[PDB]
Design a protein around this ligand. Sequence first.
Ligand SMILES: *C(=O)CCCC[C@@H]1SC[C@@H]2NC(=O)N[C@@H]21
Ligand SMILES: *C(=O)CCCC[C@@H]1SC[C@@H]2NC(=O)N[C@@H]21
Lengths: 542, 87, 542, 74
Amino acid sequence: EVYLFHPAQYESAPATTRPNVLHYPAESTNPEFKANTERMKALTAELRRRVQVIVDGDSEADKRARDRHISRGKLLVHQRIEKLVDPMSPFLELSQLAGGDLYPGEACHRGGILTGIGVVHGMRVMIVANDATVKGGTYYPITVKKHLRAQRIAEENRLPCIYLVDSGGANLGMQGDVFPDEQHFGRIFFNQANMSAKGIAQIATVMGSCTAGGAYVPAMSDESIIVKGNGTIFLGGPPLVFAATGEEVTPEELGGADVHCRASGVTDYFATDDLHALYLTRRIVANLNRNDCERPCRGREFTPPLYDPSEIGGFIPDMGADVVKGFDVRAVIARLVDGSEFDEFKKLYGDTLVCGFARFEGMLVGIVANNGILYSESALKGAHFVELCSHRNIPLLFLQNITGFMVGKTYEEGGIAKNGAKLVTAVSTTHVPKITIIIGGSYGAGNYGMCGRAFGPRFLFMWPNARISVMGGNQAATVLALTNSKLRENEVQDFKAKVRSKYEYEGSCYYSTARLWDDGVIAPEDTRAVVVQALLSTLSAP
Amino acid sequence: TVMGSCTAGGAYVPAMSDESIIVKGNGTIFLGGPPLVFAATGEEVTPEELGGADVHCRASGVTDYFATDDLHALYLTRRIVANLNRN
Amino acid sequence: EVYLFHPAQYESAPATTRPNVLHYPAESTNPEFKANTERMKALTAELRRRVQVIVDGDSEADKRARDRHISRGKLLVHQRIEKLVDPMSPFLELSQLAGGDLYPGEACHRGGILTGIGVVHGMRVMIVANDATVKGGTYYPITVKKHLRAQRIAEENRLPCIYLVDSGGANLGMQGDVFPDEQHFGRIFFNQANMSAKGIAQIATVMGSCTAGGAYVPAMSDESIIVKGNGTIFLGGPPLVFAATGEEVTPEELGGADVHCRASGVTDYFATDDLHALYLTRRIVANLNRNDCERPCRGREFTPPLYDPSEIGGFIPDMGADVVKGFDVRAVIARLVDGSEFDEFKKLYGDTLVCGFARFEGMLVGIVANNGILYSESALKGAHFVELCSHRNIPLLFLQNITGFMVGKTYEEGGIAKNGAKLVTAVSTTHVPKITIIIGGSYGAGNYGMCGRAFGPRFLFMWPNARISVMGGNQAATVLALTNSKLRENEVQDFKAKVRSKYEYEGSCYYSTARLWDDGVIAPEDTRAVVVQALLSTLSAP
Amino acid sequence: NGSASVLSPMPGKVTKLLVADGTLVQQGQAILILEAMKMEHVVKASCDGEVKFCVHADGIVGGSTLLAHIASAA
Ligand SMILES: *C(=O)CCCC[C@@H]1SC[C@@H]2NC(=O)N[C@@H]21
Ligand SMILES: *C(=O)CCCC[C@@H]1SC[C@@H]2NC(=O)N[C@@H]21
């Protein structure tokens, strides 16, 4: 009657009796649940609408530019992606909404450049394609930043790089923010050379023009392709050669496909059109002597989550509010991991930082999620869990909804700064792949403790409800009002409203996305899918 | 070497270092400043009794060397450098 | 008037004003100081007397054995050491008082074997010499243990091994404790082979007999020497060959120098006498192609301690007492380190564990010393200091006077076991050389936290006043009396006296030394010298 | 335990009692909401039974202040 079973029986049990299964059914009849669902639905609809208007174009200027692009026999950038990748395969486009409201007077769609992780011949590659319909493809500062981010991801994951080049060059209006610096246009060539030296293949396909500095992109690649009609490569353009020597030459006879493919030797493959160029790119990828898999083990015997992700938004409260309600992040985890199974690490110690083990399509992942205010115990627990995962080469997944640490004389006397430092050190010095998602708010040093942008996660994504700031909007308003003794009592509400509006504007997901502070905004229900793709991208890492 | 104040994120600089020094009068280390603690819990505390040298050098353990003034702090810094076993 | 000087002025200042100089003058007029001095003087006199009677022999049986040994043309073991090492050089003899009162009825002087670190041709070597005047040189269990300890020290410090072999073999009376086990007679040959494979030279000089297993010692060495008259090597002795085949052969014609040096080829050098054998040993050492120094930097610009070590005993109270007084260990440190200079690590945090940096003859060393009861803060401080020294490749020096941790519900709730574990892990997993000296008492898990015998220090020495036990004598008496409910009130004092006497007997320095629990007992005033020698022995480590 | 005399985690204001007085609540079930630092913290029942509140709503509590009693109703 006592100790009759065997623990393996509980390990292999139906979901009702399996003890490591999270049970968080949706309270669909609760009015707060319905309000949260409506808010999340509106946010996700707005996100999809913005992505769709970027893809299809909105203004008449976009239509004219696309008509000019098509009339030249050119494929659109997303069409080039569709016809370069394997026909039925995922594509992880990273910074979809970059450049949104970033430069006044310009609709810098996608930042003028499309970056993503695609699958060619079964191999994951990083594709960087210039959008010639955005100011002729000229590089804005955000364009350079996005290109560098794509190169960084590819280098740290050993993903071969494919550059579909169609760009006028750096824009001379903002040359101060584009040409001279460490993280500027020359860093592209620095990264390209260093990746080529490390055995990571660099492929360039010149679908259009590349002028001045951009001309280094085809020349510094391991293999390059140039299209006959539209492909031109030269360090000095026809205006420069005319202003220098007084000679008039067309771009075709200056740096066309014939001169660079028959005489110069800069390019290696002659493409008749865009489709032939993409075929040649696929042929180049096919002949990379990269092994299919170091370990032939599959391990694809996984079970989908037991709860529908579509109701995740029901559990997500309004982050922008006078008093922000709390929720259990486990209800989110139950809708993202295999079989809703989750082995919690220290269930009774942290109590505000949930640390545990889970699986995404059979891939074991350590999950660190915020569940309230960070304490010394929670920081110690997080640091210990990160060390434990690092010693086992287990990738880490951070779910950030953080509003700083606990304040007070007792907590500082107990050494909360030291424990936060321990957590930060553990996160910073680990070598396992790290993926972070901002599901709630990321404010202040707590962000630093939860693998923020500065701590080199492989990928970082934000939900449409997420807010990122140095401090919370209400906290900023209260602290600034209290500190500013010059402010009169008659002008308190206006000051608080102004600072709250500024923090709401600069903390929104779109504000962060337009500045490459994250790797895109994703819907909560797609979160699991995104994670899986990201994890797969890290499988080729050394 | 904490010659002055380090608040919020800056407080990580002393805590993440191999060895740290804090000056008695002017050295303060805390993640949350007195304005923040008052706006949160309604309590008034001076920076010295919140994150002063005594609390971080006798009880907290964040800092390793107690400096009486700037000159003593620089002397302790030189002493730390002297004991790096670098050939 | 404010900030007039430069910190380098305080760094280079007379001892009165240099701020990192420990000032602990002796209170020579204090009666307690005089009593402590008298106790320490008596203990050190007893130690020297025991060493002297071991060297010169006490009983008439020792005199007869030495007369037989000399009449054979053999040098005594200490004389062999004196004539093998460079004429004016230090020799660190390790287990001087091993085998003391260990086996009833036998005066196993030095455990039947002398082990030490000497200097030959300017190179530090490990010398292991059998004492044929102790039961004919037969290996007691303590003899095997001491030989293995010498081999371990030599292997971990890359000291070439010299074995002066004169031994009948394992004693058959205690063969159960000598022949079969991991840490038994065959482990000598295992260590010899593994050291030879690692490039550590193994040299054997057969001054006498080596029978059965001992015959492997010359045969498994890189180079071997055998003396003509007294050297015999054979796996089967004349008694065995007569009991087997019925043939009578003398040891000389069975395994003498001629057969093993002209026909067998087991030995490489033919020695006419002991002096020629030692000369050939020196010649072998001379031709080890070992570089004089990896770095020719000297760094010998050091200053002796500013206080006389001869008064250290004045600060040392009576460890065996009903209530043990406390003292400042810094007063000891001021009499051991260069210029009495000591940079304390966390002067105000631990307050019971003194951690700091010092120098011994110019060699930088981290010192961890006990100064009271271990707390969570003290354990954390010790662990952090050990990590700091490990990251800098700074050798560690532990000064143990420990009586366990702080007990209580609050301290256990605060996680004192976790912090003690952190300290133990830091001590165990470090790779820098560690030297520990028991200056006071080492009791229980605190011993484990302070680099005890089980945690692989390079060397471990005990002062003559030191006591080592699982718990203190008073603590053992009180706890055993309280726990034992069977004990009657009429029989309490006798039980406490008996357990106190047992713990005093089994915790004494001589009891520990006879069992190879340490590397010898040293006087406090010699402590600095010993440390220096030990540190030098670690300079050839990889 | 059959009584479950829980204490407040930090000073704050009790905003709303999520369950009426004398109501049966299961383990891990919310009984009241505590607001501090403009953050909603919800107090949960630690065992099954009828919950009776001790502190009035829309007030203020201190560190380790008793909130409610959870008596296992037969
Ligand atoms: C009002 O919005 C300000 C209240 C204080 C905000 C709280 S204090 C504890 C958390 N840490 C932090 O930085 N902010 C949070
Ligand atoms: C009497 O001799 C027993 C008193 C307890 C001894 C104390 S308690 C704190 C220290 N830790 C330990 O193990 N012994 C010491």
